[PDB]
Amino acid sequence: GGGCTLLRLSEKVDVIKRRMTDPEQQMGADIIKRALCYPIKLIAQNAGVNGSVVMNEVMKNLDRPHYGYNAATDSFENLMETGIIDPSKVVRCSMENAVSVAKTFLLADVVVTELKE
Amino acid sequence: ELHFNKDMQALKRMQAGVDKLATVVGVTIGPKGRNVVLESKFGAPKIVNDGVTIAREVELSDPVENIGATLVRQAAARTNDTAGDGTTTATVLSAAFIAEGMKIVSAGTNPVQLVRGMEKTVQELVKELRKMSSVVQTDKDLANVACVSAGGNTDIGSLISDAMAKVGRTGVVTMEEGKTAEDQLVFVEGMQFERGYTSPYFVTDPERMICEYENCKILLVDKKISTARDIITILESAIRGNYPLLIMAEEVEQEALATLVVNKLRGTLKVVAIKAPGFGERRSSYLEDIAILTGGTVVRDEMGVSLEQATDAVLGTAAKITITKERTTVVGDGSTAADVAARVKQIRNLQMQTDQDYEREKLQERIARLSGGVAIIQVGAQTETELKEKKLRVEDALNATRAAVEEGVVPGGGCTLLRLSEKVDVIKRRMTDPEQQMGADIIKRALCYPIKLIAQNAGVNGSVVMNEVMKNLDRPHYGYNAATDSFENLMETGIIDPSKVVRCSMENAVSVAKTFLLADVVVTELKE
Amino acid sequence: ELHFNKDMQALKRMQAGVDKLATVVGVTIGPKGRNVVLESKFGAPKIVNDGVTIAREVELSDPVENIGATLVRQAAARTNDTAGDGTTTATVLSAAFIAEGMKIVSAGTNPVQLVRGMEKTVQELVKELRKMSSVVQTDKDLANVACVSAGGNTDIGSLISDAMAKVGRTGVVTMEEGKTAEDQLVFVEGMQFERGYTSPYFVTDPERMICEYENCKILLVDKKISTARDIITILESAIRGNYPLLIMAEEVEQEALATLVVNKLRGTLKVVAIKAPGFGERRSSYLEDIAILTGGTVVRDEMGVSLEQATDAVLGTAAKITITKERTTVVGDGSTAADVAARVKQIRNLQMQTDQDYEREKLQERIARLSGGVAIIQVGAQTETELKEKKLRVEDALNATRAAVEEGVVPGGGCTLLRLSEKVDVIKRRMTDPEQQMGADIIKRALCYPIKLIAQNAGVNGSVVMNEVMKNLDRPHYGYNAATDSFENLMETGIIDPSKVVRCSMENAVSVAKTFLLADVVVTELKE
Amino acid sequence: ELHFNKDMQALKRMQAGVDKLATVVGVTIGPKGRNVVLESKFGAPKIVNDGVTIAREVELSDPVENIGATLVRQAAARTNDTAGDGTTTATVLSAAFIAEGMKIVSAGTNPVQLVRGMEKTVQELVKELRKMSSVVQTDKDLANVACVSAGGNTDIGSLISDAMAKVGRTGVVTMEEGKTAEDQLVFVEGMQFERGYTSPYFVTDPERMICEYENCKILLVDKKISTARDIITILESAIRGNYPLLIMAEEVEQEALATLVVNKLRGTLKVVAIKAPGFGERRSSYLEDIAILTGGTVVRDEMGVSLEQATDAVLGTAAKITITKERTTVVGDGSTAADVAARVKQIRNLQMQTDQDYEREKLQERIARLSGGVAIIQVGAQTETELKEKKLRVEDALNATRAAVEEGVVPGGGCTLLRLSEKVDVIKRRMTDPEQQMGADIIKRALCYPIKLIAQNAGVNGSVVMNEVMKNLDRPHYGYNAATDSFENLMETGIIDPSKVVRCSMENAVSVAKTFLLADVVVTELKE
């Protein structure tokens, strides 16, 4: 948990070369990358600490040994053994739905609305 | 249909509303307080000297600064209905923590570590406040405490003293006027509980907003009530004998509650609504404990009789009943006194065979209030405006004495807030981050505000008064009486505050200041 | 006709203007600095990468925030003409102290103890800066410093190295272009002083604003000058031979000064103004030290000849003279070199018979500059634009090398500000009042700003950069070069700053922040 | 008195102004270009089909978008005076780099790496353009290139062909009309230099802004001139004989220059001021190289005769002199032709004994221009409007032929931009950061703009045009002539552009786009 799983997910779109590798789809991949960076940034920031340095410490270190950052205690700790864990169902559903509404958002080009008079 | 308020200025907005509330209640505080004029609903205006009445009526225009002042009103009201006093102190301290809070926060300081510092500081200052407290253990010192806390002369405070000297602990003393000019002490079979009414619309006589009824029958069950036709038949029994009815069966749903308040608003049916004591098997063991005490059987389905009709056998009787916000009291009824003398025997038998721990203290708290009973006191009568003036004085006397004997006693005049303030300087916290230290200094400078406002609005500089007491030794009960304007010891003189008031107002003020500075976004429904 | 600006908000007004000045100069700083487009006075615009030019042109509409920005410009300009560089660093530091300062003052903190904490912190940080400094004592390490400090390749920086390896101390190296593509070193009879021009209107060629004249006569008297009729006869002596004239006789009053600038503006008379070196008997002993050095006599009334007609040998000759803001230099004249070799003998004579102390060092500072002379260097020429680009590169090279060897050298990139910032945490001051501690933390967070603005406007987060540098050992010259974006030691790589610049910009920034936060009331003339 | 513009929107303001300039110059481009109506200073309007006249006159109200458009005007003007043509191409490309640049920058992309990508991509494309270029080495193919580049028929372009076939390299061919209808080729003793006149106020006949004089004497010294009394005596020597005078002594200061332009504005004295060729000892070796050539001695103070008076012996003669922005040409004078034939012998002698390297090429560049001389051509005359129409057609012909033979030739129509644009897709840079790749793609989409605007304003979709040219093989000189609206090889048809124009307009466009996107803050002096 701690939204750190979104960083580990974001740092695996750099290895995704798609078909037919048109620059636009690559932009969308970079879009997902920078968008997954936001949640942990908001968590660390609104807690009271710079999120840029936290993101740097976790990412530069090995991403596999469950390295993470607990904002509740503010210290370098493994999220598993400490007790900060998130259900994968929540992460998956919130991620798919966010893209689903972003789909029907950016695709939009004309909006109508019934007015008062 | 929702308005948005964000950033740094949104906080300042409701802070101003808070500061405006603490401004009018601020000039209320002090022995030489000022008069606040209120525009009447219809007719001649009402002059106010109380901080409670002011906090009740204040509500501004701008919604953000309106919910800000109301957010402090919560702490003020909550402090009042849990300590009996200290609304003025709660508000001014609340705004003090907020003002000094916003002052430091504006320097880009982390709110989380600040509020953590405040929480721990006041918490240790509460632990320190218990050390500061002066305990009463003798009925004669209790007499001196009572008579002094009572307005003016002793005598009447000397009457309350022996009134509670009879019934040792667990209360509960109730007062009433009439009928002939003497001091009539009366002890009868009465009981109380720490539950409250269902709706604040049952208040018999404002502004006391306390529901009192004389010569009324009682009725109670354990299960939830929603059906009405059963009570309608009992309503016919309440019309059969034009008398009010008592009901306290845990949760009454919106249907029966609406029928109750409608039949009460017209005056056709005098009804009372309230909750059940305890939980689980305790409920069915508490209502049956008060059933026979009131001279009535139990209408539970466990045996079980529960139908449309209801006679005198299923409902007990109570001469007088007085219920308030968090308390419900019964007294006066001349029913089976042996029941009160036999149920206590059953508790002793159960406690003798009890191996558990929770059952020991539950039987201990039940044997307490049972044995304590109710004691009701009758006041004298000189003129028609005399006991009315007395009854109010003895009302404020009893509540003050109870609040004092409950948690202990501390030197009043707001000086106890100074002594508590000059002990945060030695507090080295963990992990001693600068932010938490700021919060400690915030508590320090905030505790300074009440005494300053007291002296200032009295007519003298508070800076010199604070300097005279602080530089002098804080231990020999040194203080400053604003009533006489002289250096005196607050204990021997007669200026004392109940420690319950100081603690509650302090904790609540930090409580609202916690959820005030922690806020960052405020929403509000708008007109259009 | 006078406007009154008071309270707390009047401070924030000029703070905004200060912050606006630091905003534009802020994006100027750093190796990956940004361009700032200036509107032309008439025609094609002018893009600027320097922080000096920007600070010259900035002046806001609102008077209060204009004089506030102008107040910072004072420290910026003063740093520029006392160190040679660091306008960008002085400004951002000045605003840093002001921003962080007012951030704390807003909490009602005592300004007096705050600025006291600032002054002492930076002063001990200057004493610490001298420890941080690296000293050059060998001409070969001086060669490596000079070449690296020079732009790009060495060769020319390797030429200035031996140029100052010849003239050991006291300077002073002066440069000039022409005529054939080689490296021509020339040592001749030249001298300089630490005085300046009378008026900034004498500047020959802006934006260098340095008055340079070739093949001109020089005139010196010790007393003050106010009369004109004597000068207009020398003007006739300056018209007889169409040549410029040099004058530095202490104080020239408004009358003669106005006549001088008027006759110079029309181009009829090429005149130069300036001031006198030393004081009292020193003046009459310094002007006669340069009179014969320029091949002229003294027109003092002590002997004394002083009439209307002045001739050829009452005024010395100087082949080339270059003067600036706080310096005045002469060079080139092929006069009595024996004088330069005989006056030094007279100084040694006075030195050995001297029993005093001040006379010993006055003779020592005079024998220094006299023996030092003025070595003029001639650069080569590939094309016509290459010689100009070189001349500018060697101009910035010489001024950088001089500013480096003068006060010592410190690691550049603004990283030395962090190493200094992480030494205030150990500073336990007297009497350690919290306010002075706030001032220390203010300096800390303020010294953090420059490196942040450099990294940020370069294109990378400054927080991570600060962390990586600070968490690592601060002693093995660890640093971060924004030009390459990589972990590197600032020394071996070639990113160095002169310690004189850091110190001057630091002290001045605190100096203006001193007179900024101490302010409480501001006045200003209005239009109507 | 200074305004402040910052953030992202400040960039878009001047970007709009740039977009407005490229809008009017945009409809100018193309064979089927449109007419731009200009309001006259006084009287009948002036229609313009040239992009040069438009770029001169355009200047908007809003200062920021004015200095933005002017910033592009600097690129267009600089391209014009360094290539001879391509103002329209420079502007549309400049705005292309800006538009496509800001289009990517708005995504928060690093400006530093972007412009770095732009610089390197276009620089390698310059190295690529030199590959795309076609070379001319035969006078007969030169004849075909010249006649085609010339408007319409050949004959006259076939005359310029043999005109330059005579004088091989180093130029320089000058033209003139009159007097009898034939083809008169004339070679005489003439010379030129790559220097320019002092002030643009000396222009004889606009809009050609080129100062031309007939039958005038010359005068040159090496030292700087500031005095005037010597000049006013030569003025008297220029008044006794009503003839203009030539002066080129390096730097003429503000005094003499002001006197010169004043005496010229009244028509009493026909003067001009020009700079010195070479540098140092070269100057004194170049002015005496043109002194005797013009039949005059040297007035240098190196020995050295220089006083008040001046006669015919100190000043040479010149039949005709034509000077422009960056060139100064003399021709026609019938002086010592033996001088031009003897100084070349002296150069060969010095060349034989020269051991250096720079002296060899300096003697080589002097022996070149000396041997090349200055061939002047005379055109025929049918009517009076035909000779002027010819003279204009041969003026643009000569300038086009020189620009084509100088840097080589490339297929015109802006199609060479596509061939250059479809070569950035193979450019893998270092360290191949995405930003530099964006800058490469920016260059690609920007090079697509000119050909698109050409086809569009002509009257055909540019999308299908780009498709046909690009999808086909880019090597067999495939192109699209908008004049005939048809598939055609740009070489064999007659639509060719000089490589110098394409290269210079491309480099300057990136240069101003460099100092455009790098900008982040813009300042501007306001009215009040």
Residue numbers in the entry:
A (entry chain H): 415 to 531
B (entry chain D), C (entry chain G), D (entry chain J): 4 to 531
Task: Pull verbatim passages from the article behind this deposition.
The crystallization of functional hetero-oligomers of CPN60 did not succeed, whereas the crystallization of CPN60β1 homo-oligomers was achieved by the sandwich method. The crystals belong to space group P21, with 14 subunits per asymmetric unit. In our study, the first crystal structure of Chlamydomonas chloroplast chaperonin homo-oligomer (CPN60β1) was solved at 3.8 Å, and displayed a rigid body and structural features such as looser compaction, a larger central cavity, less contact sites, and an enlarged ATP binding pocket compared to GroEL. In overall architecture, CPN60β1 presents as a typical type I chaperonin, with a 7-fold symmetrical cylinder structure consisting of two stacked rings composed of seven subunits. Similar to GroEL subunits, each CPN60 subunit consists of an equatorial, intermediate, and apical domain. (2) The structure of CPN60β1 is loosely compacted; a closer view revealed that the equatorial domain of CPN60β1 extends away from the central axis, with E1 (aa residues 2–136) and E2 (aa residues 410–525) domains rotating counterclockwise and clockwise, respectively, in comparison to the equatorial domain of GroEL, although the overall structures merged well. (3) Finally, CPN60β1 resembles the allosteric intermediate state. The ATP binding pocket in CPN60β1 is wider, suggesting that adenosine may be more readily released. In CPN60β, positions 153 and 154 are occupied by glycine residues that have no side chains to aid closure of the ATP binding pocket upon co-chaperonin binding.
Chloroplast chaperonin, consisting of multiple subunits, mediates folding of the highly abundant protein Rubisco with the assistance of co-chaperonins. ATP hydrolysis drives the chaperonin allosteric cycle to assist substrate folding and promotes disassembly of chloroplast chaperonin.
